[PDB]
């Protein structure tokens, strides 16, 4: 009876499951670890903090390893609920990481938006939104303290923690160029908000303090860290309103083993707008009422899942004139690739093509080494932008090859390459093994 | 007054090479179809990527 | 799974065939020199109205792994001579023509899977190395015998010949490679002939001569590796070459096919000295 | 001050954690992998594609290993908002994999829906629907390109990729049967939609290309793959009306070691309906208004979480005349078993009992060897269907042992079990090791 | 095609593909000992009802005991929205005893804090389905609830308790069942006439092993990396107006601690960690003329509006010296669960960790409070000056102020979660160290 | 076979070697004289071997 009637139901077809057993699930031995402690402390920001200002932070040697870094902002908005859309990271428009005089990485607000729109998923992203936005319908004059975590190679897992202990003679710095405009705080579209306050910023860095035995090895021995980089340059594209299905060959300039290529089509006047706006719920300001205006988003709901508002009909990657894969339609890169490679939902207008089985992880799982490729091209085919955005009958009642006239504003093309490099540490000096 | 033995000018570990350097490695390794050779020659390929050093001696007077 | 950590050990000798296929009945003779070649095991005996053993076959063998220099451990033999009746050896091909037999055969582990010593040798009786037996008798009474092994990129201890001579092999004469003299030396009764031993013959009255022709060595770049070959005769005839005693310089072997060429001949001492006159 | 204040506060109680440590995880060493590339290649479908038609697709041997396979459909919606419910996988009526003439697995459209409802969770599940349904209130005439990823033993686990380079002698192919009726596309309920378009299908396969030494090894060496199979035979329910508590004793015809036993109850007319229909907002067409009916669901919300509308009262599995575990109530199989084993949320009407610790995992973790059991029976006790489905007062406020009168429509009994088997690849020929 | 990517192979690959160690297309599964899992009901010793204390003794049906779910059958006394986690609210105190020695003890508020911090995604929704009425069920609805227990041995088979190895020791759970459960037998402080008493049962799954492993468990000594919960409650120092109160809590924790979590609550309303306010979902009737900020709209008690929370800042000090520099309250609600868990945390619940992966079981950093003389948690409160009834003021102010209704959050609950070592040998068990 | 469709064929090994390949198409002209310009070639949008 019960478990034993099951347990004895043993045969030859069990020889490859329970025969000559190797493991038992019901006694785990846990590994003992080098003793350590974590601290979160402030760094000094060098320069005036405000809209459009450039400041830098030099990370003081308060400890042995550096792991996460969280940048604090305090903003007060001049708009009611729905007028903001990740304003904390829109401000953080460009963060550059320097180690030993060498640039290791550079992230853009648009990248933080693409990463959040692509690899951060589930409850973790809802939290991120409350870390970077006004979520619970706050009104004009509401103040919020924001947290924008950085996602450099040493920020998410201790496995690549940055050893200052082993960088005795090289300083580590972060450069912070801040945006001149943040939607809902000092501008509403192009219209300035009178009396808007300047942001206040503080940069917090997480230190690890190691026990004496291992930290000595850190200071004395060489290290090789297998780390991630972001490579980027922006471009410009165009899609006609009628009679023509446009194509455009986008010329890529990337190097080193690549985990993936991700991209979007942005309206430069409204941060994170990757799809057409329309007089359907959440797709423009005032949608569903007589005041609906398809030239301005209902900002807090800028991200959508409606692929018919996206501009990409199809895309192909060619390497040295060779088709890397057969042409796929745009929904493949918006929905099937993140399904296969990540396991979450990518909002419309954000596209991914991976070279890796698990690009969300750090264990290398397949790369494209652009160091041997002379000319990589991303071939884009665009949707006809002939639907009048103000008429739901056509916006939600049409064919896959056509989108709304407001899609012609998604003129900024932003292609990101996620790569590998190796950060070597020796005798207090740091640097990347391959420089490109 | 400030002890900073290294300059910090991307010198020390940064390999600034044009990928044509691959021909330099092929000449040293003799065989050109190195699409696959580096997979069976890991130990030698790593040695070819490590450094050499020069030292800056000075002596001061003790008190 | 190695990169460049192998010596240049030049397999100078090689064997090929130009004969036809035959089944399970063999007999080779030319100009009175007979070879006894049963199907129970390739090589039994030979001579001119004489025999040199009644039971033992002229097997070759190889020791793939040396444990500590022990004997009869991990010895892969050409012939299942332990049974001496059940020829439990897989043969790849049996080529021959009159005067010139050949064979390719797969070896067996003398102990099988059974731990006759301290540990188990293998999991099966039949191992993974192919050996070669090429015999060519020449009209002048000289017969060339070639042996080959195939080692899977490992160092080993190979035995080119295991031969048992009749007790009428008391008188041995050899030439020193320095042309000192043809020395009649037997007083040790434990005979090991290093490089300096040029040619050996055993001659109570009619000689059995052995003259080495070729043996692989690292001499392309003359590496400091271990490549030593010696003769042994201690009431039993053995020709072997050693690569490494369990480990040597921690360097591996390319894994190609290595073979040896040994010249065998017979007759009175007069014919011996005339044949080995060329030095 | 700081972390140093706890590192020095070291004693005996720390030894079990940090004394004589084995690892430091701040120096993660990643394992070097085998060079490979991923490519998407289009397959050619044999046979006319259509409603109610069967076609086959043989996988073109362009690469070495096969991982995912995605079926692409182009659908035109014949209804308006909320008239469809995962129509892409309803259309994909069933698929089976045949290796050299031997079938390995057989999936049915309601399995795909069960799997999605039972094992796929969070953003992933939402994205799955995005690929298989219309989710932004699209209107009649809208065209959308749909993707249905297949879930055979090799599709979502790279480690079990089908080794075509090692099947030199066998054909590998999938058979596809497409449904005759798809709600909101070809039929609305049981009424044909005049002018409905015939969806177009394309089958895509993602290939893995190997480098020099590994391709040789895969081609020349035999392989032993541990694979998954789906076992299914359909039956009929015994759902009562008033005063009777029904009980069925369904002898199972399963074989081999399995991970779990899962089932649901279906309305054959309304695909995906696993619960009763009641005049509850979001549960029926017109629900909450005078036009509400409980004979027609609000199809876009066919699935629910309100177990009150469930038909199953209690259940147990019995093996050889003796109980496998003690009787549990229906709510136990809908919520607790998946909590204890999958880690997601299972909607009402889908029930699971596991034999494994990690049934969602690829690593074997417990089983049930049906081939060694004389009589495995699933006992299902039903709720009395006495609630008037049209009265929210009775639907939202009654006892645990009763359900809606409309539950009697769940006439199909779908019991599934997921297997273990072994796929042998030897001298270019494939077949499974164990029969039954 | 893809060949083109294999062709584009370079020097940078020496670190990625050189002398391969693994491949991703040839997985080898480890073989495991034959076992079976069975669901068995335990008998409750005592009278089940509101305010009663009962216990259960574990029947040694098998070789190890792993996952315990306590089932309740409740009748709600109100309409949808009047309840909020009633199953775990009733499950007030769960005490774990192994061999006469107290090993652990969990509280209903810890179950809500754990659900607020560590259980996430669809699993947290499903948890709510097991503990509440989530489909707007009306008065009279009857439902079977499941409250899984979260002791050290409950979530991972690797810490399953080997009863076969404990044949001489009693394993028991004591259950305190709350006298007042919101929407079931009380609405606020007002009794609901005719409310039914609860029915309870305890189900646990057993592990049955084959001959060789059960023998090893029965005869060999074992150590388990047992985790424990430590808790004592204290009062808050919530100010009314014009001042931000300071408070220093003297902590009574010991053992190698993974993290410290705490909340500010209204002891009258289970799960209320925030002030009530006349904004959507923040109080009964919110947004209408009937709105009141003295009673929550219970089913939506949990919110993410941190402006209704009372922590302006927190700092932990060890032996007179600060452990980290003072952070604002939103740091502990939004950043620490982000860094450590990767989930969400509702307003009013706060987490600070010493561990990098506290959601995991393998050690990832501890603070050992067994070696610390003075552990103090310093709090700064927000000034409770906003008129809770005016959404223009509730949704339109600065970070250092909150609702005047926050003064109801009179109870402070600080939890600590730590490591210990559970020893089992010759049929008996106990802890290696207890402080 | 049809407008906008992708089809393929596997060459049956009836013989030893392959030389010429001729694709037959049957089309109906919908317009007047001069309204077409190599329509069988336009239809043969592409071929991969």
Helices vs strands, H then E, count in chain E? 8, 26
What SS3 class is residue E158? helix
Q: Using a CB-CB distance cutoff of 8 angstroms, which residues of chain C are in contact with residue B28?
A: none
- Minimal CA–CA distance to D419: which of D255, D224, D225? D255
Q: Which two tokens stand for residue D44?
A: 């050619």
Q: Which two tokens stand for residue A312?
A: 């990409």
d(CA A349, CA A303): 9
Q: Which residues pair with A208 in a beta bridge?
A: A38, A65
Enumerate residues 6+ apart whose C-beta is below 8 A from A320: A373, A374, A375, A376, E4, E8
d(CA C125, CA C140): 41
Hunting for tokens 């990740």 — which residue is that? A86
Say if D369 is an interface residue toward chain A (CB within 8 Å).
yes
Hunting for tokens 């601690």 — which residue is that? E257
CA torsion through residues A268, A270, A274, A275, sign: negative
Burial class, C143, CB count within 10 angstroms (exposed 0-12 / middle 13-18 / buried 19+): buried
Contact between D104 and D174 under an 8 Å Cβ cutoff? The reply is no
Q: What is the DSSP letter of E30?
A: P
Burial class, D430, CB count within 10 angstroms (exposed 0-12 / middle 13-18 / buried 19+): buried
d(CA E234, CA E247): 11
User: Which B residues in the span 22-51 are in contact with D, Cβ-Cβ below 8 Å?
Assistant: 35-36, 39-40, 42
Contact between A415 and A263 under an 8 Å Cβ cutoff? The reply is yes
C33 torsion bin: left (phi>0), alpha (psi -120 to 50), beta (else) = beta
d(CA A164, CA A166): 5
d(CA D198, CA D205): 23
Any alpha helices (H) in D133-255, and if so which ranges? 212-220
Residues in chain A followed by a break, C to N above 2.5 angstroms: none
Distance from CA of A399 to the nearest CA of E (A): 30
Measured between CA atoms, the residue of chain F closest to residue D201 is: F5
What SS3 class is residue C36? strand
d(CA E433, CA A372): 60
Burial class, A69, CB count within 10 angstroms (exposed 0-12 / middle 13-18 / buried 19+): buried
d(CA C48, CA C151): 36
CA E94 to chain centre: 13
Q: Which two tokens stand for residue D433?
A: 């090791």
Q: What are the angstrom distances between the C-alpha of D290 and each of D278, D287, E138?
A: 14, 8, 21
Contact between E66 and E160 under an 8 Å Cβ cutoff? The reply is yes
d(CA C25, CA C41): 11
d(CA C150, CA C158): 10
Enumerate residues 6+ apart whose C-beta is below 8 A from D217: none
d(CA A32, CA A154): 23
Q: Which two tokens stand for residue D325?
A: 């575990």
d(CA E107, CA E129): 20
Q: Which helix (H) or strand (E) holds A432?
A: strand A429-432
CA angle D345, D346, D348 (to 5 degrees): 130
Say if E4 is an interface residue toward chain B (CB within 8 Å).
no
Burial profile C174-197: b = 16 or more Cβ within 10 angstroms, e = fewer: bbeeeeeebeeeeeeeebebeeeb
Q: What are the angstrom distances between the C-alpha of E140 and each of C102, D397, E143?
A: 98, 5, 10
d(CA E122, CA E134): 14
User: Which A residues in the span 310-339 are in contact with E, Cβ-Cβ below 8 Å?
Assistant: 319-320, 322-325
Chains A and E touch (3+ CB pairs under 8 A): yes
d(CA C32, CA C34): 6
- Minimal CA–CA distance to D62: which of D159, D150, D172, D176? D172
Helix axes D109-118, D122-132, angle to 10 degrees: 150
CA E103 to chain centre: 17
What are the φ and ψ backbone dihedral angles of A111, each rounded to 5 degrees? Answer: -70, -40
Q: Which two tokens stand for residue B1?
A: 């007054």
Hunting for tokens 């599995």 — which residue is that? D317
Contact between A158 and A362 under an 8 Å Cβ cutoff? The reply is no
Measured between CA atoms, the residue of chain A closest to residue E206 is: A3
First to last CA, chain E: 65
Side-chain half-sphere of D417: how many Cα atoms within 13 Å?
25
Contact between C140 and C106 under an 8 Å Cβ cutoff? The reply is no
d(CA D127, CA D122): 9
What SS3 class is residue E249? strand
Q: Which residues pair with D323 in a beta bridge?
A: D318
d(CA E377, CA E326): 11
Distance from CA of F9 to the nearest CA of D (A): 9
Hunting for tokens 């950093």 — which residue is that? E365
Mutate to test the interface with D, among E1, E3, E6, E23 (most CBs of D within 10 A): E23
Contact between A436 and A256 under an 8 Å Cβ cutoff? The reply is yes
What are the φ and ψ backbone dihedral angles of A37, each rounded to 5 degrees? Answer: -135, 150
d(CA F44, CA F25): 9
Mutate to test the interface with D, among B39, B41, B45 (most CBs of D within 10 A): B39
The 3-state secondary structure of D290-350 reads CCCCCCCECHHHCCCCCHHHCCEEEEEEEECCEECCCCEEHHHHHHHHHHHHCCCCCCCCE
Q: Strand pairing of E311-318 and E327-328?
A: antiparallel
Burial profile A242-256: b = 16 or more Cβ within 10 angstroms, e = fewer: eeeebebebebebbb
Contact between A210 and A65 under an 8 Å Cβ cutoff? The reply is yes
d(CA C154, CA D141): 72
Q: Residue F39's CB: how many other CB atoms inside 10 A?
A: 12
d(CA B42, CA E17): 9
What SS3 class is residue D111? helix
Mutate to test the interface with E, among B38, B43, B44, B47 (most CBs of E within 10 A): B38
d(CA E30, CA A317): 40
Q: Using a CB-CB distance cutoff of 8 angstroms, which residues of chain B are in contact with residue C3?
A: 40-44
Q: What is the DSSP letter of E340?
A: H
Burial class, C228, CB count within 10 angstroms (exposed 0-12 / middle 13-18 / buried 19+): exposed
Experimental method: cryo-EM
What SS3 class is residue F26? coil
What SS3 class is residue D278? coil
Q: Do D339 and E123 touch (CB under 8 A)?
A: yes
Contact between E280 and A137 under an 8 Å Cβ cutoff? The reply is yes
Enumerate residues 6+ apart whose C-beta is below 8 A from D335: D307, D345, D346, E126, E129, E130, E146
d(CA A395, CA A284): 13
What are the φ and ψ backbone dihedral angles of A87, each rounded to 5 degrees? Answer: -65, -25
- Minimal CA–CA distance to A375: which of A232, A234, A251, A236? A251
Hunting for tokens 């049963």 — which residue is that? C38
Q: Which two tokens stand for residue A278?
A: 């329309």
What SS3 class is residue D209? strand
Distance from CA of C243 to the nearest CA of B (A): 24
Side-chain half-sphere of D395: how many Cα atoms within 13 Å?
27
d(CA A358, CA C183): 76
d(CA B8, CA B28): 31
> Concatenated DSSP letters for A251-282?
EP---SEEEEEEEEEE-TTSTT--S---SSTT
Say if E6 is an interface residue toward chain B (CB within 8 Å).
yes
User: What are the CB-based long-range contacts (under 8 Å, 24+) for D234-237?
Assistant: D234/D412, D234/D413, D234/D414, D235/D412, D235/D413, D235/D414, D235/D415, D236/D411, D236/D412, D236/D413, D237/D265, D237/D311, D237/D382, D237/D410, D237/D411, D237/D412, D237/D413
Burial class, E172, CB count within 10 angstroms (exposed 0-12 / middle 13-18 / buried 19+): middle
CA E7 to chain centre: 53
- Minimal CA–CA distance to D274: which of D220, D310, D228? D310
Q: Strand pairing of D384-387 and D402-404?
A: parallel
Count how many pairs of residues, chain A against chain E, have C-beta atoms within 8 Å. Answer: 227
Q: Which residues pair with E143 in a beta bridge?
A: E74
Helix axes E108-117, E122-131, angle to 10 degrees: 160
Q: Which two tokens stand for residue D226?
A: 């541990």
- Furthest C-alpha separation in chain C: 54
CA torsion through residues D132, D134, D140, D145, sign: negative
Side-chain half-sphere of D11: how many Cα atoms within 13 Å?
12
Side-chain half-sphere of C279: how many Cα atoms within 13 Å?
20
Contact between E84 and E148 under an 8 Å Cβ cutoff? The reply is no
Hunting for tokens 């645990």 — which residue is that? D400
Burial class, E47, CB count within 10 angstroms (exposed 0-12 / middle 13-18 / buried 19+): exposed
Any alpha helices (H) in chain F, and if so which ranges? 39-43
Q: Which two tokens stand for residue B5?
A: 């033995």
Q: Residue D224's CB: how many other CB atoms inside 10 A?
A: 12
Contact between D421 and D229 under an 8 Å Cβ cutoff? The reply is yes
Distance from CA of B48 to the nearest CA of C (A): 14
What stretches of E218-292 adopt beta strand conformation (E)? 222-224, 227-235, 246-250, 256-265
Enumerate residues 6+ apart whose C-beta is below 8 A from C27: C34, C35, C36, C37
CA A208 to chain centre: 25
What SS3 class is residue E125? helix
Indicate the resolution in Å.
3.8
Burial class, D24, CB count within 10 angstroms (exposed 0-12 / middle 13-18 / buried 19+): middle
Hunting for tokens 């009673």 — which residue is that? E295
CA torsion through residues A114, A115, A116, A120, sign: positive
User: Which F residues in the span 20-49 are in contact with D, Cβ-Cβ below 8 Å?
Assistant: none
Hunting for tokens 């201890």 — which residue is that? C157
Name the percent of chain D in helix, strand, coil, to the closest 5.
20, 35, 45
Q: Which of D33, D223, D343 sits opposite E123 (nearest CB)?
A: D343
Say if E8 is an interface residue toward chain B (CB within 8 Å).
no
The torsion defined by the Cα of E2, E8, E12 and E15, in degrees rounded to 10, comes to: 40
User: Which D residues in the span 209-238 are in contact with B, Cβ-Cβ below 8 Å?
Assistant: 211-213
Q: Which helix (H) or strand (E) holds D55?
A: strand D54-58
């Amino acid at each position: 009876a019960g478990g034993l009637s099951q347990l004895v139901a043993y045969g030859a077809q069990d020889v490859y499951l329970t025969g000559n057993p190797q493991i038992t699930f019901f006694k785990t031995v846990y590994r003992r670890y080098t003793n350590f402690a974590i601290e979160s402390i402030q760094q000094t920001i060098n320069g005036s903090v405000g809209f459009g200002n450039k400041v830098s932070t030099q990370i003081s040697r308060n400890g042995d390893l550096i792991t996460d870094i969280v940048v604090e902002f305090v903003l007060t908005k001049g708009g009611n609920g729905g007028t903001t859309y990740y304003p904390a990271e829109e401000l953080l428009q460009d963060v550059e990481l320097e180690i030993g005089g060498q640039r290791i990485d550079k992230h853009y607000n648009d990248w933080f938006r693409t990463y959040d729109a692509l690899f951060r998923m589930n409850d973790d992203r809802y939290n991120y939104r409350r870390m970077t936005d006004w979520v619970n319908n706050e009104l004009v004059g509401a103040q919020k303290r924001f947290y924008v975590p950085l996602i450099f190679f040493f920020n998410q897992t201790p496995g690549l923690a940055l050893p200052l202990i082993a960088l005795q003679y090289h300083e580590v710095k972060l450069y912070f160029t801040l945006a001149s405009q943040v939607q809902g705080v000092n501008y509403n579209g192009s219209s300035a908000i009178a009396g808007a306050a300047q942001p206040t910023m503080s940069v917090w860095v997480d230190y690890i303090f190691l026990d004496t035995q291992e930290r000595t090895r850190f200071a004395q021995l060489p290290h090789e860290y297998l780390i991630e980089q972001l490579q980027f340059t922006g471009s410009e594209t165009a899609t006609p309103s009628a009679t023509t299905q446009a194509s455009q060959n986008i010329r890529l300039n990337f190097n080193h083993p690549t985990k993936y290529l991700a991209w979007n089509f942005n309206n430069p006047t409204n941060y994170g707008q990757y799809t057409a706006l329309a007089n359907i719920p959440g797709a423009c300001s005032g949608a569903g009422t007589a005041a609906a205006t398809v030239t301005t988003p209902d900002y807090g709901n800028t991200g959508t899942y409606n692929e018919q508002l996206a501009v990409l009909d199809s895309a192909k990657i060619q390497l040295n004139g060779q088709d890397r894969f057969a042409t796929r339609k745009g929904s493949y890169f918006n929905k099937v690739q993140p399904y296969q490679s990540i396991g979450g939902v990518t909002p419309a207008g954000v596209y991914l093509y991976s070279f890796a089985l698990k690009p969300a992880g750090r264990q290398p799982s397949g790369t494209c080494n652009f160091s041997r490729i002379d000319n990589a091209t991303l071939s884009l085919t665009y949707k006809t932008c002939s639907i009048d955005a103000t008429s739901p009958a056509a916006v939600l009642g049409n064919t896959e090859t056509v989108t709304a006239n407001t899609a012609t504003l998604l003129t900024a093309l932003n292609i990101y390459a996620k790569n590998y490099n190796v950060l070597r540490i020796m005798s207090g000096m740091g640097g990347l093994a391959y420089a490109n | 007054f400030r002890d900073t033995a290294s300059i910090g000018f991307s010198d020390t570990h940064q390999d600034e090479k044009t990928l044509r350097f691959l021909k330099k490695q092929i000449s040293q390794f003799i065989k050109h179809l190195k699409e696959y050779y580096p997979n069976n020659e890991l130990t030698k390929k790593l040695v070819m990527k490590y450094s050499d050093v020069q030292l800056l001696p000075y002596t001061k007077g003790a008190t | 799974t190695f990169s460049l950590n192998v010596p240049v050990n030049n397999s100078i000798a090689t064997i090929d065939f130009a004969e036809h296929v035959n089944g399970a009945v063999f007999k080779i003779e030319y100009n009175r020199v007979n070879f006894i070649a049963p199907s129970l095991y390739p090589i039994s005996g030979l001579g001119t109205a004489v025999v040199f053993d009644l039971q033992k076959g002229e097997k070759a063998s190889q020791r793939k792994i040396t444990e500590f220099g022990n004997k009869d451990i991990r010895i892969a033999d050409e012939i299942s001579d332990i049974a001496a009746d059940d020829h439990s050896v897989l043969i790849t091909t049996k080529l021959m023509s009159e005067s010139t037999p050949g064979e390719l055969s797969r070896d067996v582990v003398l102990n099988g899977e059974i731990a006759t010593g301290r540990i188990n040798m293998n999991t099966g009786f039949v191992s993974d190395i192919i050996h070669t037996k090429k015999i060519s008798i020449i009209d002048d009474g000289i017969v060339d015998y070639y042996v080959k092994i195939n080692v899977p990129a490992k160092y080993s201890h190979g035995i080119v010949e295991v031969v048992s001579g009749t007790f009428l092999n008391d008188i041995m004469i050899h030439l020193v490679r320095n042309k000192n003299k043809w020395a009649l030396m037997d007083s040790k009764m434990y005979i090991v002939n290093n490089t300096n031993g040029f040619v050996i013959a055993k001659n109570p009255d009619t000689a059995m001569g052995v003259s080495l022709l070729e043996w692989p060595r690292g001499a392309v770049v003359f590496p400091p590796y271990y490549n030593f070959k010696k003769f042994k005769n201690v009431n039993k005839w053995s020709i072997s070459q050693q690569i490494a005693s369990c480990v040597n310089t921690s360097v591996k072997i390319p894994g190609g096919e290595y073979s040896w060429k040994i010249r065998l001949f017979f007759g009175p001492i007069w014919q011996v000295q005339e044949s080995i006159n060329s030095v």
